[PDB]
């Protein structure tokens, strides 16, 4: 960061000789893994698509990734999970019925 040294302004704060401590593993709680990547990919081709997911990719192909997000935002919690869901569907299509 490097605080400016004054009590207002942009980087406002006291100058101190700084450290950057050792990273905590609890910061990596999200991280995927090779173990869970395999299992989730495996159960996906086991259990397949859910009703709202089928109507989502057909909405994508025949409407696109705007009206998709708008639907998936109503379906899921909100606009960001809807973003990341439509993307997960894009890669359902691409990797499968294509290449």
């Amino acid at each position: 960061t490097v605080k400016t040294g004054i009590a207002i302004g942009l980087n406002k704060g006291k100058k101190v000789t700084s450290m950057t401590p050792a990273p905590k593993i609890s910061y990596k709680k999200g991280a995927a893994s090779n173990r869970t990547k395999f299992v989730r990919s495996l159960v996906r081709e086991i259990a397949g698509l859910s009703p709202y997911e089928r109507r989502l990719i057909d909405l994508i192909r025949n409407s696109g990734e705007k009206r998709a997000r708008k639907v998936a935002k109503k379906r899921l919690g909100s606009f960001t999970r809807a973003k990341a869901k439509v993307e997960e569907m894009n890669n359902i299509i691409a990797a499968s019925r294509r290449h």
Binding site: F38, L42, V43, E45, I46
Partner: protein
């Protein structure tokens, strides 16, 4: 973890197992790992050969 480590040459899966979930993924797993498997009548007969009441897999 055997099937995952490709160490199994044959897997016998029961046709029973009332929480069928414990098993259903094994056909997929054995397939993706190239392990040959078979669905055997008698989860209890898998037990006898292993000295349990019911073995659910051998």
């Amino acid at each position: 973890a055997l099937i995952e480590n490709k160490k199994a040459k044959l897997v016998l899966i029961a046709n029973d197992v009332d929480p069928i979930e414990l098993v259903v993924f094994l056909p997929a797993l054995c397939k993706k790992m190239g392990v040959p498997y078979a669905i055997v009548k008698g989860k209890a007969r898998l037990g006898t050969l292993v000295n349990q009441k019911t073995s659910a897999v051998a």
